[PDB]
Structure formats: structure tokens, C-alpha cells
């Protein structure tokens, strides 16, 4: 009764269904992302790119492009270089 033949694993169809139901992140307009981007900066002075993506819910490439124009990367030797939401 072990390793019974199966077309797809139950854990895999659920994850596939969840990904399909959620759908891919859409590329929103720059103005809305900027407004949401700066509102996030208010809560925390420093933000990680991986965590920042979740707040913005935007594609990584699109978020980086908009963040690159205004945001800058500050190198921290303690952990790693992260992004700065302050334009200056």
C-alpha cells in the first residue's frame, strides 16, 4: 500500500491550484506604486527587498526599476546590502 501510483501528489495540486487562484502579480502604474512605496517607508526606516516586494505586491523587476530611480542601496557589513527608500 506504499507509494501507490498517482498522476499528481495531493500537496502539489493544492499548491498549483493556490498559485493559479492567486494569479501572477500585475504591474501597476508607477504613481500608485510610489504612493504605496513611500507609505511603507513610514512604518520602518529600512526595508528588505524580499519583504518590500510583499508589501508592494509588484513584480520584482518592475519594483527594482522604480526603486532604482529613487531608492538607493546601502551596504551593511553586519548582514548584507539592502535598499534605502529615502531618495537622498
Amino acid at each position: 500500500t506504499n507509494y501507490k501510483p498517482v498522476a499528481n501528489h495531493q500537496y502539489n495540486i493544492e499548491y498549483e491550484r493556490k498559485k493559479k487562484e492567486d494569479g501572477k502579480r500585475a504591474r501597476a502604474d508607477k504613481q500608485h506604486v510610489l504612493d504605496m512605496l513611500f507609505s511603507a517607508f513610514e512604518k520602518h526606516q529600512y526595508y528588505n527587498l524580499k519583504d518590500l516586494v510583499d508589501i508592494t505586491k509588484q513584480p520584482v523587476v518592475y519594483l527594482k526599476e522604480i526603486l532604482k530611480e529613487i531608492g538607493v542601496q546601502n551596504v551593511k557589513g553586519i548582514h548584507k546590502n539592502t535598499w534605502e527608500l529615502k531618495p537622498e
Binding site: 507509494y3 501510483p5 498522476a7 499528481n8 501528489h9
Partner: protein, 298 residues
């Protein structure tokens, strides 16, 4: 290389340790050197050579690992050892090593012999080096290679059976399977109903007589073309159900489907196609615990 015998094949007399001309008996060259180990494998082993390099490793390297420290000189000022092993394995070799580990893990799940694993490892190396499937996950390639190795060895496993032992789904295995065949410019013989009878019937715990009856029923049904276009696994599951119901050891459709990986509806449909000609399909010398007339009608 006898001077007086152009193009003569010298014969090695190992006991005498020399190469001789078979024609004149002249001894040519120096003493034959035994290229094997100078020690014997029978206190510590007096070996001065490393373990054999893995044949299935593109640009496979050879290296030594630093052992555990013993004295205080081996340890840094604060505990941790100053001499620590470093990861010097190539990315290509590291990925290939992980795939072989995955190939063996899947094979052990369904108790595949080591020869099939070795064939799978060779298949993965060719696909990995050919690099037509570089876009696909290595586990899917390994799962597809495992499927192909079973077919090449004459003991096919169903895509569902391979998927059960693999995190990769059946669809992704089937897709990588097609690409691997294209990349390798190789083919696999078509599966027949008899390629699964031994495993399916043994897993269902059916006697040899019932297994033989199921093997005959499926083979005869295919020859009679009573199940055109049906998957061979569906035909075999229906044949096993027919043979099982005609003997003392009776198995339900759910039982046969679970081992066969076929939904009970599919077994019902295939069985319904071969049920009308049940007496013709059964072997002549079959002892019917349940008469063929009283076989289930569904």
C-alpha cells in the same frame, strides 16, 4: 614486436612475467609490470591509492578532505577548528551528484535493482551533458530518465508509479520523457499488457494461475482488438479483474486500481469491452471457481 616477425601478436606469459613471440618464442621487451595494486587486501590497510573516480562525472575531479582535529594546535584560539573542509566541487558535478542521489532514492522506494539505477545514471549524464533539457528541473529529468531506464531494461513502470516515488508530477515526467528521447535520438519499445502482469498480480497477491489467466486474457483481448485505443495498463487492470473474479482470490476494482494506478471507472469500461467474449479470452486449462457465465456483468 619480434624483429623477425613483422606484424606478430606477442603473447603475455604472466607467470614468467615476459612477452614472447608466438612463432619463434623470442622474448621481446622488458619484464611485464603488474599494473594492479602492489599490496593485498587482507592493523590498517596498506593502500596508497584513492577510491576509484566516479565514471559518471563530467570533468570529475579528485580531492582529499581534511580530517577532524586531534590536538590543541588543530583548533583556533576559540574552539572552532582552523582547518575546515572547503566546497571545491564543480557546480555541474555538484548538480549531477545530487541527481544521482535522487535517482537512487526513487529507485529504493519501488525496490528497483541497481542495474536499472546504473542505466538511469548513464541516461541522466547524457541528457545533462547534451543540455537540451537545461530548462527543466533536474528531478524531472531524473524521474524521466528512471522511467526510460525501466523501459529499456524490459521492466516498464507506469508514469504514475514513477510519479509516486518522485515529487515531480506525471505530466512533467511525461514531458521530460519525450524531450530525453529526442535529445538522445533513442526510442523505447511499446509497452504491452504483459509488461505489468507480474508486478500488478504479485502486489495484489494473486496466485500464479490467476496471473497466467490475466496475462492470457489481456494478450488475447489485444490480439482480438476488443479494446482498441485503450491504454495497456487499463487493459491489464481489467484483465486482472476478470481473472481475479474467475478464481477464489477475488479483488475489487478499487483494489486493482490502487495497485494498477487506474481509476475504477476505467477498469469498468475496459472490463465491459472484454466481458462479452470472456470464455474465448480465458486459458483453456483454467479452473473456474466462479463459472465464466456467472462472471460480474458491469
Amino acid at each position: 614486436t619480434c624483429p623477425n616477425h613483422p606484424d606478430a601478436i606477442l603473447v603475455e606469459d604472466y607467470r614468467a612475467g615476459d612477452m614472447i613471440c608466438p612463432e619463434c618464442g623470442l622474448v621481446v621487451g622488458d619484464r611485464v609490470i603488474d599494473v594492479g595494486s602492489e599490496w593485498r587486501t587482507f592493523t590498517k590497510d596498506p593502500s596508497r591509492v584513492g577510491d576509484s573516480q566516479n565514471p559518471l562525472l563530467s570533468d570529475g575531479d579528485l580531492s582529499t578532505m581534511i580530517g577532524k582535529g586531534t590536538g590543541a594546535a588543530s583548533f583556533d584560539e576559540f574552539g572552532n577548528s582552523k582547518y575546515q573542509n572547503r566546497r571545491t566541487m564543480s557546480s555541474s558535478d555538484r548538480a549531477m551528484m545530487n541527481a544521482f542521489k535522487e535517482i537512487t532514492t526513487m529507485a529504493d522506494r519501488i525496490n528497483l535493482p541497481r542495474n536499472i539505477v546504473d542505466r538511469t545514471n548513464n541516461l541522466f549524464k547524457q541528457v545533462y551533458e547534451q543540455k537540451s533539457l537545461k530548462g527543466r528541473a533536474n528531478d524531472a529529468i531524473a524521474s524521466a530518465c528512471l522511467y526510460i531506464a525501466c523501459r529499456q531494461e524490459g521492466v516498464p513502470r507506469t508514469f504514475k508509479e514513477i510519479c509516486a516515488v518522485s515529487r515531480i508530477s506525471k505530466k512533467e515526467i511525461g514531458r521530460c520523457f519525450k524531450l530525453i528521447l529526442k535529445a538522445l535520438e533513442t526510442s523505447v519499445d511499446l509497452i504491452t499488457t504483459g509488461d505489468f502482469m507480474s508486478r500488478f498480480c504479485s502486489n495484489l497477491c494473486l496466485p500464479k494461475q490467476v496471473q497466467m489467466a490475466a496475462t492470457h486474457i489481456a494478450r488475447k483481448a489485444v490480439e482480438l482488438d476488443l479494446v482498441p485505443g485503450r491504454s495497456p495498463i487499463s487493459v491489464a487492470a481489467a484483465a486482472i479483474y476478470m481473472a481475479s473474479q474467475a478464481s477464489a482470490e477475488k479483488r475489487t476494482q478499487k483494489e486493482i486500481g490502487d495497485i494498477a494506478g487506474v481509476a475504477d471507472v476505467t477498469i469498468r469500461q475496459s472490463y465491459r469491452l472484454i466481458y462479452p467474449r470472456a470464455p474465448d479470452l480465458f486459458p483453456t486449462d483454467f479452473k473456474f471457481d466462479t463459472p465464466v457465465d456467472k462472471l460480474p456483468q458491469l
